[PDB]
Amino acid sequence: PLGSMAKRNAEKELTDRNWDQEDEAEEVGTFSMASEEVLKNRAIKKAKRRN
Amino acid sequence: VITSDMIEMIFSKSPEQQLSATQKFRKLLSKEPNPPIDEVISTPGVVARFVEFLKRKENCTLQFESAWVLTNIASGNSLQTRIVIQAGAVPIFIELLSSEFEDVQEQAVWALGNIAGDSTMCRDYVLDCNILPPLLQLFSKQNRLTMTRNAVWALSNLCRGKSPPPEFAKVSPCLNVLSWLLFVSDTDVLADACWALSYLSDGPNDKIQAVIDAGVCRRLVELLMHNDYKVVSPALRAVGNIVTGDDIQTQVILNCSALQSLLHLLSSPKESIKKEACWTISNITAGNRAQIQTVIDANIFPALISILQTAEFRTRKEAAWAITNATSGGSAEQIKYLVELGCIKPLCDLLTVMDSKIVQVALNGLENILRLGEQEAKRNGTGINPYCALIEEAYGLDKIEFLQSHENQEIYQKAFDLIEHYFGTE
Structure with missing residues (x-):
């Protein structure tokens, strides 16, 4: 939190022949799960709950 | 569709049959649906001839039509553009920029505009032929909308290209003219001026300073309020581009009341x-504390949160960045504020997303916050983190648990750490 580069350049270039296309439409989706084998491999945790 | 008569006249030595022929050509080549470009190009010497017609200093109408022809040939196909370049048109089109017949000038600028905008290769070629000085020289005098419209459009095409971008040193000399064009009323000239600025401002910090040094930020920011989406879009991007520079550069944008x-x-x-x-x-929220504060003060975060609930996903991704950026550069008091507006919830709902990236963004935001609540814990209480409860009730704790199944190892570990850290797991 002192001297990182948090700046992000634009992904695609925008042009006069390009700007108004209404591209695709993003699929929120679900995060990619790990392989069964890896899943058992690693140790999981059950968060202590309350309020 | 192409007769021998038209060919005989073209090659004869009377400037009258030559012109009459040339006209038949362009009128045919002006057929939207399929111009007989193949035939024209097929008949040998025709293109080379049209090019030689451009040299007729004494003949305004003949030059005008020849350039019109070569344009219909070149414009609308990279290969035939190559053919025209190969006949030597470009150096001459450039020559015609400085002729007494303005119509020839307009036509030439157009042609050159079309050529340079065909590809990276053609853009860099037309520049190597010094189109710039005479092209920029056109702006000097009061020219009709149409002449200006084509001129600035040419410049746009000469600045366009991200891979590879043009040698900056070759397109920067047009910066002054650009900033001047940002005060024209016409929305086409305005739009294309922004586009060129949109292009130049895209890249490293040294290039950004060049744009800034031309004095466009104020007018650029002023243009974000424009009614037409075709001038707001490129202006926004140019502005947006500039604030990818260092804190000092992006402060220049801030100082124009862009917020x-x-x-x-x-x-x-x-x-x-x-x-x-x-x-x-x-x-901007990725800058210094003061800049973050300016964003808060602009009363912007209320809108960013509603955007995280209403707007489309690809937009939300951006808004999520704004928040997390604030959370990592912001003060205890600043974060407290974002949380007060209920930013924990929107972040939580992004934990289980497809984009492995936005997940990290959401984890980063929630961590920073927890890091605060970890502070507030010791310094008062009954020291229990106030925030991991708010996270638990936003179903974030459930999602962080799940994330311990993510494909990405680093993400798995983060979720694992956050739990063992701020919550615990028997």
């Missing part, structure tokens, strides 16, 4: 504008 304009654009109907506005804001 209230941006706030306005977050309500814009056009999703494209929203997204682009968040992206911009994101790059």
Whole structure:
């Protein structure tokens, strides 16, 4: 939190022949799960709950 | 569709049959649906001839039609563009920029515009032929909308290209003219001026300073309030681009009161504008504490949160960045504030997303916050983190648990750490 580069350049270039296309439409989706084998491999945790 | 008569006249030595023929050509080549370009190009010497007609200093109408012809040939196909370049048109089109017949000038600038905008290769070639000085020289005098419209459009095409971009040193000399064009009333000249500025401002910090040094920021920011989406779009991007520079560069944009304009654009109907506005804001909330504060003060975060609940996903991605950026550069008091507006919830709902990236963004935001609540714990209480409860009730704790199944190892570990850290697991 002192001297990182948090700046992000634009992904695609925008042009006069390009700007108004209404591209695709993003699929929120679900995060990619790990392989069964890896899943058992690693140790999981059950968060202590309350309020 | 092409007769021998038209060919005989073209090659004869009377400037009358030559012109009459040339006209038949262009009129045919002006057929939208399929111009007989193949035949024209097929008959040998025809293109080379049209090129030689451009040299007729004494003949305005003949030069005008020949350039019109070569244009219909070149424009609309990379290969035939190559053929015309190969006959030597470009150096001559450039020559015609400085002729007494303005119509020839307009036509030449157009032609050159079309050629340079065909590809990276052609752009860099037309520049190597010094189109710039005479082209820029056109602006010097009071020229009709049409002459200006084509001129600035040419420049746009000469600045366009991200891979590879043109040698900056070759397109920068047009910066002054650009900033001047930002005060024209016409929305076409305005739009294309922004586009060129949009292009130049895209890249490293040294290039950004060049744009800034031309004195465009004020007018650029002023243009975000424009009514037409075709001039707001490129202006926004140029602005947005500039705030990818260092804190000092992006302060220049801030000092133009861009923030209230941006706030306005977050309500814009056009999703494209929203997204682009968040992206911009994101790059500002990625600056120093004071700049973050300016964003808060602009009363922007209320809108960013509602955007995280209403707007489209690809837009939300940007807004999520804005928040997390604030959370990592912001003060205890600043974070407390974002949380007060209920930013924990929107972040939580992004934990289980497809984009492995936005997940990390959401984890980073929630961590920073927890890091605060970890502070507030010891310094008062009954020291229990106030925030991991708010996270638990936003179903974030459930999602963080799940994330311990993510494909990405680093993400698995983060979720594992956050739990063992701020919550615990028997």
